[PDB]
Amino acid sequence: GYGYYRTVIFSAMFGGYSLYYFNRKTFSFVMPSLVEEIPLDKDDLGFITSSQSAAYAISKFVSGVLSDQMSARWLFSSGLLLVGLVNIFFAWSSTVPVFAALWFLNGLAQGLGWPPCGKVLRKWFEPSQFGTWWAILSTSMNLAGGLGPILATILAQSYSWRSTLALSGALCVVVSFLCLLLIHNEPADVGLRNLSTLQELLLSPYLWVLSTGYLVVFGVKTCCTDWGQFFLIQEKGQSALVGSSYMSALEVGGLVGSIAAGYLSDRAMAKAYGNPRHGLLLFMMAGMTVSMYLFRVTVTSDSPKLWILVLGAVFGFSSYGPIALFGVIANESAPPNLCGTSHAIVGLMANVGGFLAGLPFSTIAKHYSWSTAFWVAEVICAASTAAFFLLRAEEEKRKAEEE
């Protein structure tokens, strides 16, 4: 069949990338038993996570470029196999430089995992159904992060942490061979109807304007997601429960934002003057700017908890959503032989925006104020969003001048 192989491959990629993000954060999930068995300094823990972050930052770009030419099935399954073998080796090992070297190799394979899912979603799902299944496969990450600490607590209650990571690695080995058996790269590999130069991709201005948009939106995400609790504790007198519930409501709004961004974007593609995935994208960046303004101005010590959770969920709907849409458009606006390169350049701008939003935002927050820092992030977001509204208005004027 056609939809049969579609749902078999999507369930295989769902389970595979679920075990990917389960092993992207397994050390963070198993941290209490590991620090109970052997003492590790917090600088060592931050270094192990930072080595994974640097390896995953490199391996996003390297995996996109290498997933352009190589087959997506073997590359996905080989990465998940390396993930499993790394977690087995992590269960065998008992020291911090070997923990960091193995977790660096895990960061490499975690980067190796996703651009095959992007290539297979592009080959199997038409653009009327590409965004919503992109969104479901990207909230496989959210399901893995939700069932991570729960299964970590269950396996720490029942088993040791050694056997927990050994069973996680063995499960990722078995599911890597199952994703090698189940996933197919294109419908031409079975017998179904299968549905430019790299300099032309790099010299295309739409890739770079999408790149700067993803820079701004992921920087705003990283700013608020890393410093919203600090903005509510230190300046506006909110409790730690309010900041923690703000982050939880922002993540719930982000789940809803990814899913609704994919579905409403595919509804916009189906009902259709430019890319139809922009009418949700720019309206939702404008909603992100409105949520930042309402969160910076109207939140006070006397603000109701319901209103600050509403602003958290509205920002989560409006920041995770445009990032999911930038992933969809970056995989989609490129040619099929260069789509991993486009999504890889977008992930490179994720790394640039994460750097620009982590530490310089803390410096603007330390020297001026927290409100002045989020005002700077709001000025960047509002200026960029108004610039994109001017760009789509200018493109509509150009397309009117064509006809």
Add this chain to the structure above:
Amino acid sequence: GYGYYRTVIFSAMFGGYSLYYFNRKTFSFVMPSLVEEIPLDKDDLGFITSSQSAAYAISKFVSGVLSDQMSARWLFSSGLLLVGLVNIFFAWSSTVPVFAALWFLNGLAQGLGWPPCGKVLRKWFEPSQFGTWWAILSTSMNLAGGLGPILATILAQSYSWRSTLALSGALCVVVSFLCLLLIHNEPADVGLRNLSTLQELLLSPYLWVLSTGYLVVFGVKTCCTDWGQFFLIQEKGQSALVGSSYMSALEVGGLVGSIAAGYLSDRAMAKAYGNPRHGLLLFMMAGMTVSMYLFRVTVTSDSPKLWILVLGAVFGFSSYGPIALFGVIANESAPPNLCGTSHAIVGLMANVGGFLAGLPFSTIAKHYSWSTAFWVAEVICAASTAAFFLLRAEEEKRKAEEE
């Protein structure tokens, strides 16, 4: 004439890149007057230098790729003009986030400076004279770092620090217009005899084996240059004078290593079975491995100061030298329309090796020992160097099998 325009353009690039590295480190040179006028935390100083380091890391690659297509004269002079305008704006400004934003823009333009010098040295100097003038133009950086604190002390004694950076920025503006007037891109732009795809460059294995060699050599450089004083204070009982004089002798040996690497490499190109710039390169990586072995084993608390300065100078001759040769070969083994891309990928591996050698080497040093950490770096260096000797022996066997 021909040699007349050659020496005019080389003196112009010498003065220009000298003012580049003078303004890459002017904040580090003017630090005492700046912290006397306004108090800055050491985290803020490390953040300003780290923002320059990240911007320079990005701008190496971006400037190589953009110096492939764009003209080298305008790009060099525009970068030096942005350097001057940034230092003037830095003299006008009086706060830490604006210091960091301007110094980020300075890191961008400092990255923008050098790949035009690489392109112009490739267009004007033949390969029998390319390496030695590469070496002299790269020790313009050493001359700038040597005359940096001296002129900083003189201008802090005579003038303020505001007017010091204002005169530095004004001098870089004037010298940017002079480097726009004096430098020429190619000999065809005057009337003299002027002497492949990017996928073919990326898929070439020689670029990637040169890439991994530069990874190893710059990692070994960064390891010993950042942790030799720590290896001599904490483990081997040497004084702080011995560690400081070790770093000074390693930098003097590095000056000699860059100059002698360029000159002996061009002598090897002139006397000539493979690239003739390898017989010095691999012998000198082997000398780097021998210097690391003799520094790890034979240095003790009872070691003479002359012997440890000899090992510092022998490592400096043998680590800065292969990095200068990797720069020469990366600019040279690529086609002239893609040479900045090759040197940009090599600078990307400078960033990867700097990350891999800064903090994980500190972790191996903290958990095992300092001697075990430099033993790990020595194992990486010796394994890589023996692998390159096996590669050139295998290539000589292949070229014997051809004829």
